[PDB]
Design a binder for these strands. Structure first.
Ligand SMILES: [K+]
Ligand SMILES: [K+]
Ligand SMILES: [K+]
Ligand SMILES: [Mg+2]
Ligand SMILES: [Mg+2]
Ligand SMILES: [Mg+2]
Ligand SMILES: [Mg+2]
Ligand SMILES: [Mg+2]
Ligand SMILES: [Mg+2]
Ligand SMILES: [Mg+2]
Ligand SMILES: [Mg+2]
Ligand SMILES: [Mg+2]
Ligand SMILES: [Mg+2]
Ligand SMILES: [Mg+2]
Ligand SMILES: [Mg+2]
Ligand SMILES: [Mg+2]
Ligand SMILES: [Mg+2]
Ligand SMILES: [Mg+2]
Ligand SMILES: [Mg+2]
Ligand SMILES: [Mg+2]
Ligand SMILES: [Mg+2]
Ligand SMILES: [Mg+2]
Ligand SMILES: [Mg+2]
Ligand SMILES: [Mg+2]
Ligand SMILES: [Mg+2]
Ligand SMILES: [Mg+2]
Ligand SMILES: [Mg+2]
Ligand SMILES: [Mg+2]
Ligand SMILES: [Mg+2]
Ligand SMILES: [Mg+2]
Ligand SMILES: [Mg+2]
Ligand SMILES: [Mg+2]
Ligand SMILES: [Mg+2]
Ligand SMILES: [Mg+2]
Ligand SMILES: [Mg+2]
Ligand SMILES: [Mg+2]
Ligand SMILES: [Mg+2]
Ligand SMILES: [Mg+2]
Ligand SMILES: [Mg+2]
Ligand SMILES: [Mg+2]
Ligand SMILES: [Mg+2]
Ligand SMILES: [Mg+2]
Ligand SMILES: [Mg+2]
Ligand SMILES: [Mg+2]
Lengths: 63, 129, 386
RNA sequence: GCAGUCAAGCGUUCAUAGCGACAUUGCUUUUUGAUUCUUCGAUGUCGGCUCUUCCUAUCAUACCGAAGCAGAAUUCGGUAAGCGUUGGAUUGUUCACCCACUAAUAGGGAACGUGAGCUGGGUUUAGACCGUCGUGAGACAGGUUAGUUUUACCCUACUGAUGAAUGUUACCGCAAUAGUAAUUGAACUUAGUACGAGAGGAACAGUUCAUUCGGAUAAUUGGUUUUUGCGGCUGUCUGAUCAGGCAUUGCCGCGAAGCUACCAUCCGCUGGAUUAUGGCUGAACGCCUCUAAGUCAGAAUCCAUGCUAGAACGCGGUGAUUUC
RNA sequence: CUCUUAAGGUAGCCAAAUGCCUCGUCAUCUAAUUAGUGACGCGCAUGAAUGGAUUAACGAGAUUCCCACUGUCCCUAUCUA
RNA sequence: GUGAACAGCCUCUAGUUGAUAGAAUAAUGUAGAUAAGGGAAGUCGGCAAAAUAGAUCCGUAACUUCGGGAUAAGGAUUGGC
RNA sequence: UUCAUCUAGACAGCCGGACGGUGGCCAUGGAAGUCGGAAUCCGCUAAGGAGUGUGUAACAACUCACCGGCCGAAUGAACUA
């Protein structure tokens, strides 16, 4: 099996977990759960959402 | 020739026309192969052939019943690999009773189940899921 | 006049009455037909429903669109510590059915099974089987006489086994005792097997094996008093309905001038005995085997217990049976897993399943990590520790 | 309304494949009449919705016989009611009609089932308008609009739920009786084969799915949120802060658990006896004959296997049975 | 050309809240319309202050279609008092 | 106080804390809510509910008795500092 | 009940023959026993219809009425209830 990545939060997605969203431009978005899916639908910025790997990278958290 | 897909387009649903035939939407009036149950609306899923009319589009396509094939669903369904997925919208393409497309191109993605079910949809398709 | 539109009736008339099962342990009402050429073996096993998880495996089904592809499936985990054999029952056949001639018990019975014979164990003098254990005083002559009666009679032989709840995380502390038919030949050696196994444990791997179709017999989750709309699935009456809409509108014609048994009525839902067949064993896991949740593809040295424990159950420490799909009953409930009554050869049976991965993320939430090691590796150092 | 009998004819020939005149015998009571026996100290009067069951004069599905049955399709008929028999536009409508799917969209009963189950569009009080009629008040199976749908806590029935008594108490069982369930399609392949000049074009075996139904289940996905769990926001109040109250759950995002969805997943058994029918042997009747004696196969049928309940006045095995 | 009246329904309007036949006919609206609308009119039985025709605005009046919207429904589920 | 406001919501003075209670949290209710995808397919009928909503700026059709229609329709903005 | 056949050999059964004038007359596009109308003859005859059916376009070719070979005692038809 292959572990996917949450398009919003960077979380690791295991088989069957979360949802997959195909945008009209054929882009694929994987969400590990309804929280990340709902923030994406609300058009929040992961770089602004403080628990996402994208925010942690932009803010040099962990490193 | 296809596993069950959560029905998301009951009779009366209007999806976008994804082909270049001159139709802008398809209005579901029936679903091929659908069963019977009192009060239950016939409902389509990705890859189903429906009977539909063109509500808006070129006048030559309107005011008549024609087969269509659902290429995008937007109602979440579960693939056997455990993936719950959905598109941004519901979309279909006009076809004849034998499954051949009336148009010559699809705009936007096409569900993999539909592409496997209908080779003409697959041949005219761009991105597939 | 006629119905004016045909629909199938709501509910199954063969599962009536929708009453509470008389016991929390569902009775095995039929054992597999005896083939007296095979060795002596139990026809069923007792376990406790721990909970569900999900697995990943490669489907082997030629002609399927998912042949040699990956499929995610739901599985149920049944905690199955070995059952202790404590007795044997002989059944003679009669023009009035089967009839127990006599039961021979083991000499020493654990407190687990002894509790089953007591409503108030804590204040009893625990006299159960104290005079019976004296039947083994010097030679066990009476015990051997009863076993000889069973051999001379008793066309059907069943052992009495009890669970070891002390090995489960359950608080119940009172074992479940059940009769399991012994299949295999020579009723004499059925009796010999039972006598030799007195006071001894039998593990689930000696009863069940990988890929085997089994049946699950359990009392379903109870839901109390239920109205027709959910108890039977009848159509909700329109919003305009005076006096409520979660009802059946016409509960009968004028004649017969009686409500008929087939009309949906409100009553108890759930807590019914159910025997559901053809659940494939996906794993026969052992408690002592660390890497219980591991496969030949995952190799993560982890057990079957999800992170944080099986919700409302605890941790799997014993032998366990992983069946495909779902089985009747809720978590912590005693379940009887029995061998199939027929030889299924349908290519859905007979398929050799190899698990590729077993989910162990927490079921207490949207579990993100399979192991605490993976959680630490993803999250880095936190303030508390790690 | 449905079904027979006869058989002049139709069916290119040919009465009876399928039909069938002139006649004639019936059945049914889902038509409408006829009657006025019951009800006028009152049986709630259309239709629909909902739900159960029953009938068979069978639309489909099973197995078959016949054909003007080459195949395919169809038609006639037998056992058959086990199983299903739909979504819509217009109309109060029943009925009708069309669109459409479907294996098929069969007909009916149950106080023209079903109003203390609903609804109240219609009819069928009182308001009002029109047309025709009437001098008029007013009439109108003419049209139109508005118009209170009451009560169960009793008995039974039904659904579930306790329970005295059998020395007590406990555990494990048996199984009388009662119920019972699965359903239908598609695709691949057989096979572009059999068959057919051709056009076309099967089936059995095998495989993957699906429809309708049913029983569970909550790993996942989704829904639900008083977890008032975390955060945010408005207004006001606690001098400010922190932290809070109130806004009838203040509002918003996320939200675990639980519950739950063909909106999720899993599961839904195999033996015998038969019906129609086709056969064996074989007389009656030197032949013939599935039938008479005997006998073989055989249906979605039946009875079992299996599944649910367990007789609270059916039964068995087993443990312990009170020093005072 | 007849019979005939007090006068023989004029201007208008209509299957209209007035048309039996009738779900009239044509067109439009829909996949499908006994609905709606526009036309037609030998109109059972339309029609001129018993007011005719029309009308901006107004209407808890009757009606049809469309967009939005939704648990009305598919098909139900859940929560609170 | 907010606010256009005698609106709603919170507060001061004053007044009251009165409605039979206790325990549970089944069905069916009454009242209040939410709901994937579809969006009136429900129904006689969109009944009920939802959606809209304040203010500022832009923009506003047929028709009209010239007065209206009109908040037509249709858009954009709004906090804090 | 009635009428028939029958040791001068019945019924059934199996087997043999089932001819010639003659493609009888008429027609028909063709019609030979057999799509039809009409005539129902004669010889050989133990016996054979100008034909009981199948068959051909017509032929042909099979088949039956009819008579024989075998068997040997009963049998057939139409009615009545
Ligand atoms: K009366
Ligand atoms: K949840
Ligand atoms: K506050
Ligand atoms: Mg969730
Ligand atoms: Mg309906
Ligand atoms: Mg019916
Ligand atoms: Mg259910
Ligand atoms: Mg009401
Ligand atoms: Mg969980
Ligand atoms: Mg009364
Ligand atoms: Mg009454
Ligand atoms: Mg019949
Ligand atoms: Mg009635
Ligand atoms: Mg009633
Ligand atoms: Mg009533
Ligand atoms: Mg009624
Ligand atoms: Mg009314
Ligand atoms: Mg009135
Ligand atoms: Mg008058
Ligand atoms: Mg009247
Ligand atoms: Mg909330
Ligand atoms: Mg206060
Ligand atoms: Mg608060
Ligand atoms: Mg024979
Ligand atoms: Mg017989
Ligand atoms: Mg009993
Ligand atoms: Mg005029
Ligand atoms: Mg008129
Ligand atoms: Mg009109
Ligand atoms: Mg309409
Ligand atoms: Mg005048
Ligand atoms: Mg008038
Ligand atoms: Mg007014
Ligand atoms: Mg101010
Ligand atoms: Mg919704
Ligand atoms: Mg939505
Ligand atoms: Mg919409
Ligand atoms: Mg409608
Ligand atoms: Mg309807
Ligand atoms: Mg209507
Ligand atoms: Mg309203
Ligand atoms: Mg505006
Ligand atoms: Mg306007
Ligand atoms: Mg001829």
């Amino acid at each position: 099996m292959k572990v996917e990545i949450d398009s919003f939060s960077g979380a690791k997605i295991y088989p069957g977990r979360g949802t997959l969203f195909v945008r009209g431009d054929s882009k694929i978005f994987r969400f590990q759960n309804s929280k990340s899916a709902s923030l994406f639908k609300q058009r929040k910025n992961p770089r602004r959402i403080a628990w996402t790997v994208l925010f942690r990278k932009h803010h040099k958290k962990g490193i | 020739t296809k596993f069950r897909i959560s029905l998301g387009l009951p009779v009366g649903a209007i999806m976008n026309c994804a082909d270049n035939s001159g139709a802008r939407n398809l209005y579901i009036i029936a679903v091929k192969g659908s069963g019977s149950r009192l009060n239950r609306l016939p409902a389509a899923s990705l890859g189903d052939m429906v009977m539909a009319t063109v509500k808006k589009g070129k006048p030559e396509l309107r005011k008549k019943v024609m087969p269509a094939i659902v290429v995008r669903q937007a109602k979440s369904w579960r693939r056997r690999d455990g993936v719950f997925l959905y598109f941004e919208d519901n979309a279909g393409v006009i076809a004849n009773p034998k499954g051949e497309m009336k148009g010559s191109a699809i705009t936007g993605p096409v569900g993999k189940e539909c592409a496997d079910l209908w080779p003409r949809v697959a041949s005219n398709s761009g991105v597939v899921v | 006049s006629h119905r004016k539109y045909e629909a199938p009736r709501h509910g199954h008339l063969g599962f009536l009455p929708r009453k509470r099962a008389a016991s929390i342990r569902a009775r095995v009402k039929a054992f597999p037909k005896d083939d007296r050429s095979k060795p002596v073996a139990l026809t069923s096993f007792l376990g406790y429903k721990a909970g569900m998880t999900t697995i990943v495996r490669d489907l082997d089904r030629p002609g399927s669109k998912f042949h040699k592809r990956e499929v995610v499936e739901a599985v149920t985990v049944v905690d199955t510590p070995p059952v202790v054999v404590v007795g044997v029952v002989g059944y003679v056949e009669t023009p009035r059915g089967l009839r127990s001639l006599t039961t021979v018990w083991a000499e020493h019975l654990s407190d687990e099974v002894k509790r089953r014979f007591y409503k108030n164990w804590y204040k009893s003098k625990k006299k159960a089987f104290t005079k019976y254990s004296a039947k083994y005083a010097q030679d066990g002559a009476g015990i051997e006489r009863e076993l000889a009666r069973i051999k001379k009679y008793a066309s059907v032989v069943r052992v009495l086994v009890h669970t070891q709840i002390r090995k489960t995380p359950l608080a119940q502390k009172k074992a479940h005792l059940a009769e399991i038919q012994l299949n295999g030949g020579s009723i004499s050696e059925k009796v010999d097997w039972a006598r030799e196994h007195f006071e001894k444990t039998v593990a689930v791997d000696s009863v069940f094996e990988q890929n085997e179709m089994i049946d699950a017999i359990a009392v379903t989750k109870g839901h109390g008093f239920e109205g027709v709309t959910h108890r039977w699935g009848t159509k909700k009456l329109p919003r305009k309905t005076h006096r409520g809409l979660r009802k059946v509108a016409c509960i009968g014609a004028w004649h017969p001038a009686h409500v008929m048994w087939s009309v949906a009525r409100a009553g108890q839902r759930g807590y019914h005995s159910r025997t559901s067949i053809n659940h494939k064993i996906y794993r026969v896991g052992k408690g002592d085997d660390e890497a219980n949740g591991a496969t030949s593809f995952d190799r993560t040295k982890k057990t079957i217990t999800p992170m944080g424990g099986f919700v409302h159950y605890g941790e799997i420490k014993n032998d366990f049976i992983m069946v495909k799909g779902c089985i009747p009953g809720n978590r912590k409930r005693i379940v009887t897993l029995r061998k199939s009554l027929y030889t299924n050869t349908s290519r859905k049976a007979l398929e050799e399943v190899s698990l590729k991965w077993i989910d162990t993320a927490s079921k207490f939430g949207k579990g993100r990590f399979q192991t605490p090691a993976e959680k630490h590796a993803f999250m880095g150092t936190l303030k508390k520790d790690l």
